[PDB]
PDB file of C-alpha atoms and ligand atoms in Angstrom:
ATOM      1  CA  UNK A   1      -0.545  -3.440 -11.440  1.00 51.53           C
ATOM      2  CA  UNK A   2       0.459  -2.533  -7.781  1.00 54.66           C
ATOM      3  CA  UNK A   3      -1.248  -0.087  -5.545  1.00 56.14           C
ATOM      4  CA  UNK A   4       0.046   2.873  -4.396  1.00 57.05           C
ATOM      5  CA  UNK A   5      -0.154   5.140  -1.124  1.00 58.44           C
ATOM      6  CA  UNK A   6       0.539   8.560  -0.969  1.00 57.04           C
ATOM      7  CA  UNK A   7       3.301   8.944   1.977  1.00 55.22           C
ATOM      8  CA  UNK A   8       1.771  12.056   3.222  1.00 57.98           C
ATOM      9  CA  UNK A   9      -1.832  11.391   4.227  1.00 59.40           C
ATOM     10  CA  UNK A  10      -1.862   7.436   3.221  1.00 61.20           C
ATOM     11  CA  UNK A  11      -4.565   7.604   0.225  1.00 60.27           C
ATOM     12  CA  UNK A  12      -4.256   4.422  -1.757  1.00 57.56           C
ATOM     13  CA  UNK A  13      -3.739   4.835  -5.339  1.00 57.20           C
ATOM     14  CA  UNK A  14      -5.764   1.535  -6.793  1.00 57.36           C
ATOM     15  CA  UNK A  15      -5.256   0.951 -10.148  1.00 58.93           C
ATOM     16  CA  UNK A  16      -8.381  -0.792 -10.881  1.00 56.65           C
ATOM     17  CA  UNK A  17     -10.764   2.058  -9.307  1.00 59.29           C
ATOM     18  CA  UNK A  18      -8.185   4.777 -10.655  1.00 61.24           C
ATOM     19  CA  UNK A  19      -9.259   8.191  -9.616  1.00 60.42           C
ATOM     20  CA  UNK A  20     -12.021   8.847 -12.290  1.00 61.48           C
ATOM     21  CA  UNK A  21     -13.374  12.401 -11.575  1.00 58.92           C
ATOM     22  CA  UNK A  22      -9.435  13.794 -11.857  1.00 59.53           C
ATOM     23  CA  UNK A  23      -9.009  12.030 -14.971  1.00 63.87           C
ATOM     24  CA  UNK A  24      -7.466   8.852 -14.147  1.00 63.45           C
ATOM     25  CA  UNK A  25      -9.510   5.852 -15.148  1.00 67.01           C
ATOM     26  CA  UNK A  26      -9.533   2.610 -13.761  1.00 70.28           C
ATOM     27  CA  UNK A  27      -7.103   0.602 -15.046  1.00 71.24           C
ATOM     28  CA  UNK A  28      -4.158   2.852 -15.113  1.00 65.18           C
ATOM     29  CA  UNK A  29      -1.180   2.277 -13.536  1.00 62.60           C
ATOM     30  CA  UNK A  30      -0.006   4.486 -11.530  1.00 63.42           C
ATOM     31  CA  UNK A  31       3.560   4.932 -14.186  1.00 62.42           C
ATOM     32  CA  UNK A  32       1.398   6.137 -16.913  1.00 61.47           C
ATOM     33  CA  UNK A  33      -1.225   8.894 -14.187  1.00 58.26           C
ATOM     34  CA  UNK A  34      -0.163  12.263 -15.879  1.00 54.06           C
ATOM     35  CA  UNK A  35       2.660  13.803 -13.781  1.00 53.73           C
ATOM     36  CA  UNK A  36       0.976  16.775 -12.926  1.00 52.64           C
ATOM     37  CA  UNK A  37      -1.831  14.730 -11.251  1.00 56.61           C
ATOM     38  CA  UNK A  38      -2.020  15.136  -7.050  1.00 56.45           C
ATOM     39  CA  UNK A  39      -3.396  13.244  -4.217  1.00 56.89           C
ATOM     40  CA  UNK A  40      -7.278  13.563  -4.006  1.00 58.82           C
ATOM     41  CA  UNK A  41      -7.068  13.721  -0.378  1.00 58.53           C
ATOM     42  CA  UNK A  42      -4.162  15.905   1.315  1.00 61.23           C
ATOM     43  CA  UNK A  43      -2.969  17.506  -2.579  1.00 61.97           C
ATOM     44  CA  UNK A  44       0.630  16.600  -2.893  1.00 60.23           C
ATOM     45  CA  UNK A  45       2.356  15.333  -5.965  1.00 59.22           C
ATOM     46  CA  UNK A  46       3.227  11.680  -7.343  1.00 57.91           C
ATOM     47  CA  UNK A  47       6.564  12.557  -6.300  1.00 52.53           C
ATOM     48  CA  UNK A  48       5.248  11.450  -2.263  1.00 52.53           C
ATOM     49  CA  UNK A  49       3.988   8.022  -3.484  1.00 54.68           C
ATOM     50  CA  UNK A  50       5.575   4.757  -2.957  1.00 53.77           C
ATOM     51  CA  UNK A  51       4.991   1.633  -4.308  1.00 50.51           C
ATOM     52  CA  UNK A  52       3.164  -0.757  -1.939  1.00 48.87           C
ATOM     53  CA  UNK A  53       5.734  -3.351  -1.452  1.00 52.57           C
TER      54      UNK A  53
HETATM   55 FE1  FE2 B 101      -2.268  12.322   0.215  1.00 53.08          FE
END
């Protein structure tokens, strides 16, 4: 599974850490991260991430 990075503040999105205390365990790619989830950092939505590649 690729990584991630939210195109507002640059968080990475890892798949294998996944973002645990919002719900999102490791292992999930970042497809299947419930749609209403948001960056840990800055807040914005999926909709700002890109694929890294
Ligand atoms: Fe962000």
């Amino acid at each position: 599974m690729k990584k991630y990075t939210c195109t507002v503040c640059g968080y990475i999105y890892n798949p294998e850490d996944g973002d645990p205390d919002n719900g999102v365990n490791p292992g999930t790619d970042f497809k299947d991260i419930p749609d209403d989830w948001v960056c840990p950092l800055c807040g914005v939505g999926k909709d700002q991430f890109e694929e890294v590649e």
